[PDB]
Structures are given as structure tokens and as C-alpha cells.
Design a protein around this ligand. Structure first.
Ligand SMILES: Cc1ncc(-c2ccn3ncc(-c4ccc5c(c4)[C@](C)(Cc4ccccc4)C(=O)N5)c3n2)cn1
Length: 890
């Protein structure tokens, strides 16, 4: 009791709302989620206690590894006959280094042995472990050394890997034994939907809290499966709005047995001609227990989002508005003197088998009645090619009603080309129980597809729980922890599309978060960052509760980060509101005084970076901290790295704290840049990008990683077109000059292509940066997509002079020709992976990012990548856009 009350206070602090507010929720789905989700918590904790203490160390410090053990060709050529130089440090009480030359695919135990041999020569293996010097990353698992991300980065960047030898007992002692306690809250016939001979009818009674300045109003309604209507929309009779009452039964063109599992009532109160929506709301026609909704219901509605022309909002969240001081539409559903439940799978399978059997016995003339019917023997070779051709089309490509009939009719052949599944599912008649039942049985036995292809089936086009269950099973089987970490933002976002709180996706994500602390860390922060959003605050709040009960000791470390962030929010809010007009000098005096307060100073020191929890943030170097003069006035913050071997990585950790701007756009752009870079490297195309760390922690508040040893193009030129080339020539004298120009041209090529494809905000001297070694990169990816196509990054003469090595006619050179060749190969490489990028954007539609509101916004990428065109026409398109932007050259 006392232990639980203390734990509840900690969880309450982590999530930003008290636990007791969840206890007060009457909704049975909420209380059932809280109870039933603890099974996932139990399972996760058992795996942690399985092979203790190693399994606990693997949870807290998981291997930061790539998915593939294999290496590219150009990366292997940087090695010395398939070998790497590695420095292994040993602390003695002084720092003793031991330089080893070993095979890139050596196991940590072999690496430790070779270090002990060198120590012996100067005058056992299983008692030690390797730690990365300067941060809390360990090599606890027997992987090839090159598969560890730190090591592969050192090879690619041409740096020396510095590891530290540490005793196993030193690490294991630092990890406390967590004790997961189960909380206190853990303690008329029934007929099928299919035996109901009746059409769908819903009564609209009346609205309350209809506060407006607007002649008459009406309740628009519709029956939807995802974004797709299952019948025509039905309106009520018009009413002045002075009196909001109707009491009118709306009749829909759908037979009750034909209602699919994920069917939803979508509605809105509108005003008139120029029709305009006032408030909107969506309801699941079946509840979480598979029961059809019956009797009276009251739905609090939402305010209309900005820029939405449509009267209904089908893809908007389902369920009632938490704010009860809002338009509250009263509804009544039809009653059938019994509990109406959705039929179970055995009944569905029986009917599917019955339909399949009947269809196989259809004559030529019967099959001829419908283009959705087709006999098995009539499947020709040209049809098989057409199906194959349809499967290679991108997700935004239109599937015609003819192609839908075609796809459905050959659905059994579609099993042999399993990547076509998304196309087949949109060809299904979701308002026909005969078809849907057969689709379920095909989905049940459907072959496994790649995680990236499965991810599409979790977006807003695929609401059916069998479809989404199949997708989750593909992730469980094939998604690596590396790729899960990479796609975690998308997977968190598609939780919003789930009909119910308890589902297969959230169970999969929670288990991974509770068996891998690196995943758990960002899982927590992605959820916590949107707790202000009342669309998702209950779902995310309840999910966070279940995480915080089972995550173990890390809750306390998370609470250090939460308090640190809250203190920075509080200080920046005061500077923004109270002391915005004052000078840099006076604001800094206020800031230093407030931070040096006893409670603030402890809160802002000695915690883990939310950008990367392997980085320890020690004491604040307040002398190095700065308020910057840019928009929103971000804090440049500087902490000591308290790691014993900090000098070998970095002595100071610099982070930008920014309060006022939305950073979710930047997060998505930075993720995509990293994926683009990854595709280029695997294709033998070394275009070095700089996807700096960026984490939204809240409503228009977040953290940004500082790139060390970097300057803006304005900072170069301010101290003439040759100034930039002269700066790099001065910074890289002698033999290393060519490496700098080569790094500049390669990085410049990557950013030219990447920014053009994505439609990033206009580039200029203040938001383009360059490192000392020549590495060019961009900052502030505030806007993207169609915010005709644009060229955001225009290579002015400054940049072209660097590529051509100080030549006057830089446009006509072999260096520029090679730079163009990099851009063409880079552009076409991304073209081949267009589905991934389209899907990654499609999974983010549910977020409230104003640049990504509909599928029309994502269609910008279809234009920039030229997907309707051929590969040669795509190059010619790309060249034309570059030529017109630069006024000749391409
Ligand atoms: C004069 C000057 N000095 C230093 C740097 C500077 C130096 C290094 N790094 N490494 C990352 C950034 C970085 C990343 C994203 C974003 C930003 C900065 C700003 C622009 C915020 C901001 C503006 C001004 C100063 C610092 C931050 C934003 O909005 N997004 C950065 N910046 C730039 N310009």
C-alpha cells in the first residue's frame, strides 16, 4: 500500500498527470486495458529475470548493432586486408592503452583475449566486457566487431575505435534488481450479427452546448471503413440551431450482417450554397468486446481542423471529446431484444469455405454475370503479368474499379505474389460479408512480407483487425531492434488509428519497450511529447502507466530527465513572456541566477541526455551556456561529460533547447535523410549526410544535437565568391586538401538530391553549415513537401567554386561532371525505394503536422521522384529542374 502510493507518485510525475485520474474513469474499456495489459508487463519482466544478471544487463545496455553483419565493398576497402586497428584501454590505480590489429569480424571475447595477450607480453577472458570510451555503451553480446554501430562509424569516418576494458562485476553491481509488483487494480439472448435480417438505422435525438454567433444546421452522417464509405451519406432535416433537436431516424443503404468489423459512424454538425462543418465526431459501430452498439449514447464533438474543406472527418480519431464543455450530440441506436455480437472466426471460416465451394462450382455463364467472378482454368499468362505489374505500383497510384474487380477475381493467384496484398485489400468489397469472410481466410494463411511492406498495412487505409494483426505478426517475426528503433516514430503514430486500446500493435510495442531500454526510452518520450494532445492523451497516458510500472529502475532515471526538461520549459517560458524585450546581457544574468538556485541546479545536472541516454550529462558549464538571438530564442546548453575517458569522445556535451517551434517536421526529415544515406552507402555511393539528433519532448518544445566544429556559410563569408573555397583550403592544407573537396562535393550532392525530393524550406547562408573537414550539411528542416516543384538548395557560385577547385569556369569542368553523376545516381537510387518513403509519410498523416494533412500532400514526392515517368524521363526531369533553378548548367 505505502510502496504502491510512492510508485504512483513517481509514475504520475513521469506522465505529467496523477494515476488516480485513471481510477476515476468509468469506461470499462479503460479499466480492462489497465488490467489486461499487465500480462505484457509480466512477460517482459520474466525475460529480464531469465538469464540473470546478463539478461538484465542486455535490457539496460542492449547491443547497438546494425541489422546486417555483412559490409559494403567501398567500406571494406578502407580496412587493411579485412582488418581494423583498435585501441583497448585498461584503467589501473592511470590509463594504459593497448593498440590491437585484428580482423573486422572478431567477437568481443577474442578482442578481450588479444588485449590480455598484449598486457601479458609487456611483463580471464570471460570475466571482462568491452565498453565504448566516453559513453555508456557496451558490447555485451557476441556479434562481429564491425556490426556494432560505433565500430562501423569509425571505419566509415576514418577514426580510431577506443574501447575500455571493464570487469563484469563492476557493471552488474551498478544495475539494481528491479521488483515488479502487480498493482491493486489488477484484482435477452446473445445473437450473432449475421442472423439479423434488418437494414441499418441510427436515431439522432438532439445536440447541447451548441454555442454559435449561422442560420440553420443539420447532422451529416456516414458509414465508413477507414476512409472508404460503405454506403451513401445521410443528412437530417435542417433546423435553426436556436433549437438543436431532430429525433429523426436516418436510414442507410447497408444490410446489418454486411457491416464489417471495423465499421464506424462518422458524423458532423454542419451549417449552410456554402456548407461548412462546425463540429465533428466518430464512433465505432462495434465495441472492444465485439458487441454492436445499442441504446442511447452521448458523443462530445471536436473542433474542425484548419484547412479541411470536407464536411465529415472519417480519418479523425474515434470516440468522445474529453472536454465536456463542447457540442454534445445525443444518439440512439437500434435495439433487437438481445446482445448483438460480431460472429467469431469459426463461423467466419465456415461461411468463407461455403462461398469458395459454391464459386468453384459456377458455370461459365454464372461467372459471366460479374467481373468480380472468374473461373480457375481461364487464368492466362498475360493476366499473371498484369497482376505482377499492378503490385510494383506505388501506394498513391490509383487502382481503377476495373483493376479492383480483376484483383479480387484472381485473389487466389495473388497468394503467389504476396507483396500485392495492400492492393488486393483495397479491392475488397468491405460492405459484403461474403467477400470479407474470404479475405480473412486468405489473410490468415497469407505468406510473410517484409517489415517495410507490412508497415503500410498499419496506416489509416487498413482499419481491419485481421489485416493489422497480420502486419504485426510480420513485424514480430522479421523486424530487428535496429529497424524498430529507426521506425519507432511511425509505429507510435499508427497506434492512433487503432479502434481500441487493447490491440496486437500496442502489445508488440510495449513488450519491445520493456525488453529493450533503448527502444523503451524513445517509446516513453514519443508518447510523453503528445500528452498535451487530447485526441490521444488517454490512450498514451494509459500506455505510459503500463510502461512505467514495468520498466524497472529506469523510471527514476526518466524522472530526472522529466524534471530537468520541466525546469527548462519554466525558465524559457518566463524569458518568452516576462523578459522578452530585455538585452542578451540582462537575460543571461536572470538565467544564471535562476539556474544557480539549489533546487534548479540539482535538477539541471547529473542526468541522461534524452537525445541519447548513453550520454551522461554531468555538471552544467554555465559560462559556456548562451541564449541565442534567433527565432524563439533557444538555449545553447553545455554539460561536462563525467565519463572517465571523456577526452576520447567529447569532454563537453552541447545541446540546443528550443521552446516555441514544432520540431516533429525536423524529426521526420532527419529520419528520412538517415534512411536515404543508408540506401546510398549500401549501393556503393558514399554521400555523407549529417542527420543531427532532434527530439520533440512536448508541445512545440524539444532538444537538438549541436554539431561540433561547424560554421554557417554566413560565418565563413563575413569572416566575394572565393571566400568559402579559401576557408576550406586554409582549413585543409597540404595532402588533406583533396579529401576535403571530395567530402564537400559528396555531401553537397546528397543534400541537393534529398532536399529536392522532400521539398524542404528554402536554403540560404544561415541554414546551411559546413564542418572544418569539408562536410556540408543543412539545419532547420521546418517545412517539407508542397508547402510546379521547387529547388530548395540552389548551388550559388560559392559552392561550385569549391567543387571545381578554385577554377573560374566551374560549370564546365570534369569535377562538376562527376558531381552531377553523383546526383543522378543518388536521385535514381531513392526512386527505387519510393514506396518506403511514401509509406513513412503515410504513417505520419494522423499527427497534427500542418504540412502533412492528406494523401495529396504526400503526392508531392510522386512528382519530385517522377514515378509515372520512365527512369530516363526521370533523369531528364531532374536535370530540367536543376537547369532552370541555376539558369543554365544542367
Ligand atoms: C549563429 C549560429 N551559431 C551556431 C549555429 C549552430 C552550430 C551548430 N549546430 N548544430 C546543430 C545546429 C542547429 C540544428 C537545428 C536548428 C538550429 C541549429 C536552429 C537554427 C536554432 C539555432 C539558431 C541559432 C543558434 C543555435 C541554434 C533551429 O531552429 N534548428 C547548429 N547550429 C548556427 N548559427
Amino acid at each position: 500500500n505505502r510502496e504502491e502510493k510512492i510508485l504512483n507518485r513517481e509514475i504520475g510525475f513521469a506522465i505529467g498527470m496523477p494515476v488516480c485520474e485513471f481510477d476515476m474513469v468509468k469506461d470499462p474499456e479503460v479499466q480492462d486495458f489497465r488490467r489486461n495489459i499487465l500480462n505484457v508487463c509480466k512477460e517482459a519482466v520474466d525475460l529480464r529475470d531469465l538469464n540473470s544478471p546478463h539478461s538484465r544487463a542486455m535490457y539496460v545496455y542492449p547491443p547497438n548493432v546494425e541489422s546486417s553483419p555483412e559490409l559494403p565493398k567501398h567500406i571494406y576497402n578502407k580496412l587493411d586486408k579485412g582488418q581494423i586497428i583498435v585501441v583497448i584501454w585498461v584503467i589501473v590505480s592511470d590509463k594504459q592503452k593497448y593498440t590491437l590489429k585484428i580482423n573486422h569480424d572478431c567477437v568481443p571475447e577474442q578482442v578481450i583475449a588479444e588485449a590480455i595477450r598484449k598486457k601479458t607480453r609487456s611483463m580471464y577472458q570471460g570475466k571482462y566486457i568491452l565498453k565504448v570510451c566516453g559513453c555508456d555503451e557496451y558490447f555485451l553480446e557476441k556479434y562481429p566487431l564491425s556490426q556494432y554501430k560505433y565500430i562501423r562509424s569509425c571505419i566509415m569516418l576514418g577514426r580510431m575505435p577506443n574501447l575500455m576494458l571493464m570487469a563484469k562485476e563492476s557493471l552488474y553491481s551498478q544495475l539494481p534488481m528491479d521488483c515488479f509488483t502487480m498493482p491493486s487494480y489488477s484484482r435477452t439472448s446473445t445473437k450473432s450479427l449475421w442472423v439479423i435480417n434488418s437494414a441499418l438505422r441510427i436515431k439522432i435525438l438532439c445536440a447541447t452546448y451548441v454555442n454559435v454567433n449561422i442560420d440553420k444546421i443539420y447532422v451529416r452522417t456516414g458509414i465508413y471503413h477507414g476512409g472508404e464509405p460503405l454506403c451513401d451519406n445521410v443528412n437530417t432535416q435542417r433546423v435553426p440551431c436556436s433549437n438543436p433537436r431532430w429525433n429523426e431516424w436516418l436510414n442507410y443503404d447497408i444490410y446489418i450482417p454486411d457491416l464489417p468489423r471495423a465499421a464506424r459512424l462518422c458524423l458532423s454538425i454542419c451549417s449552410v450554397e456554402e456548407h461548412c462543418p462546425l463540429a465533428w465526431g466518430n464512433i465505432n459501430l462495434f465495441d472492444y468486446t465485439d458487441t454492436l452498439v445499442s441504446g442511447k449514447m452521448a458523443l462530445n464533438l471536436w473542433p474542425v481542423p484548419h484547412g479541411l474543406e470536407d464536411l465529415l472527418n472519417p480519418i479523425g480519431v474515434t470516440g468522445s471529446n474529453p472536454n465536456k464543455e463542447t457540442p454534445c450530440l445525443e444518439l440512439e441506436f437500434d435495439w433487437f431484444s438481445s446482445v448483438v455480437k460480431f460472429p467469431d472466426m469459426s463461423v467466419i471460416e465456415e461461411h468463407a469455405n461455403w462461398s469458395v465451394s459454391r464459386e468453384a462450382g459456377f458455370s461459365y455463364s454464372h461467372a459471366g454475370l460479374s467481373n468480380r467472378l472468374a473461373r480457375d482454368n481461364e487464368l492466362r499468362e498475360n493476366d499473371k503479368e498484369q497482376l505482377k505489374a499492378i503490385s510494383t505500383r506505388d501506394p498513391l497510384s490509383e487502382i481503377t474499379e476495373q483493376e479492383k474487380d480483376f484483383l479480387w477475381s484472381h485473389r487466389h493467384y495473388c497468394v503467389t505474389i504476396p507483396e500485392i496484398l495492400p492492393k488486393l485489400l483495397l479491392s475488397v468489397k468491405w460492405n459484403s460479408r461474403d467477400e470479407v469472410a474470404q479475405m480473412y481466410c486468405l489473410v490468415k494463411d497469407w505468406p510473410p512480407i517484409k517489415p517495410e511492406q507490412a508497415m503500410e498495412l498499419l496506416d489509416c487505409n487498413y482499419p481491419d483487425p485481421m489485416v493489422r494483426g497480420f502486419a504485426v505478426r510480420c513485424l514480430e517475426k522479421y523486424l530487428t531492434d535496429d529497424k524498430l528503433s529507426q521506425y519507432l516514430i511511425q509505429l507510435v503514430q499508427v497506434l492512433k488509428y487503432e479502434q481500441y486500446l487493447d490491440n496486437l500493435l500496442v502489445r508488440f510495442l510495449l513488450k519491445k519497450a520493456l525488453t529493450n531500454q533503448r527502444i523503451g526510452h524513445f517509446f516513453f518520450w514519443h508518447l510523453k511529447s503528445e500528452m498535451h494532445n487530447k485526441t490521444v492523451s488517454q490512450r498514451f497516458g494509459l500506455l505510459l502507466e503500463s510502461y512505467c510500472r514495468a520498466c524497472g529502475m529506469y523510471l527514476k532515471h526518466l524522472n530526472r530527465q522529466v524534471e530537468a526538461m520541466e525546469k527548462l520549459i519554466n525558465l524559457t517560458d518566463i524569458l518568452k513572456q516576462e523578459k522578452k524585450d530585455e538585452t542578451q546581457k540582462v537575460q543571461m544574468k536572470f538565467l544564471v541566477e535562476q539556474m544557480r538556485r539549489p533546487d534548479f541546479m540539482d535538477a539541471l545536472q547529473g542526468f541522461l541526455s534524452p537525445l541519447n541516454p548513453a550520454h551522461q550529462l554531468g555538471n552544467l558549464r554555465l559560462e559556456e551556456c548562451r541564449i541565442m538571438s534567433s527565432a524563439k530564442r533557444p538555449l545553447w546548453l553545455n554539460w561536462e561529460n563525467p565519463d572517465i575517458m571523456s577526452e576520447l569522445l567529447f569532454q563537453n556535451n552541447e545541446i540546443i533547447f528550443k521552446n516555441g517551434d514544432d520540431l516533429r517536421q525536423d524529426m521526420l526529415t532527419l529520419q528520412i535523410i538517415r534512411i536515404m544515406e543508408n540506401i546510398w552507402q549500401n549501393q556503393g555511393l558514399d554521400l555523407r549526410m549529417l542527420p543531427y539528433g532532434c527530439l520533440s519532448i512536448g508541445d512545440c518544445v524539444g532538444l537538438i544535437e549541436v554539431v561540433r566544429n561547424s560554421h554557417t556559410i554566413m560565418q565563413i563569408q563575413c569572416k566575394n565568391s572565393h571566400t568559402l573555397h579559401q576557408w576550406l583550403k586554409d582549413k585543409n592544407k597540404g595532402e588533406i586538401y583533396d579529401a576535403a573537396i571530395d567530402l564537400f562535393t559528396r555531401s553537397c550532392a546528397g543534400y541537393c538530391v534529398a532536399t529536392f525530393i522532400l521539398g524542404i524550406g528554402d536554403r540560404h547562408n544561415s541554414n546551411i553549415m559546413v564542418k572544418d573537414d569539408g562536410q556540408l550539411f543543412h539545419i532547420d528542416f521546418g517545412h517539407f513537401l508542397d508547402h510546379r516543384e521547387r529547388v530548395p538548395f540552389v548551388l550559388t557560385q560559392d559552392f561550385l567554386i569549391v567543387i571545381s577547385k578554385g577554377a573560374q569556369e566551374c560549370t564546365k569542368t570534369r569535377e562538376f561532371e562527376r558531381f552531377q553523376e553523383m546526383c543522378y545516381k543518388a536521385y535514381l537510387a531513392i526512386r527505387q525505394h519510393a514506396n518506403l518513403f511514401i509509406n513513412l509519410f503515410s504513417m505520419m498523416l494522423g499527427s497534427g503536422m500542418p504540412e502533412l494533412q492528406s494523401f495529396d500532400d504526400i503526392a508531392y514526392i510522386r512528382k519530385t521522384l517522377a514515378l509515372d515517368k520512365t527512369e530516363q524521363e526521370a533523369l531528364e526531369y531532374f536535370m530540367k529542374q536543376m537547369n532552370d533553378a541555376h539558369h543554365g548548367g544542367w
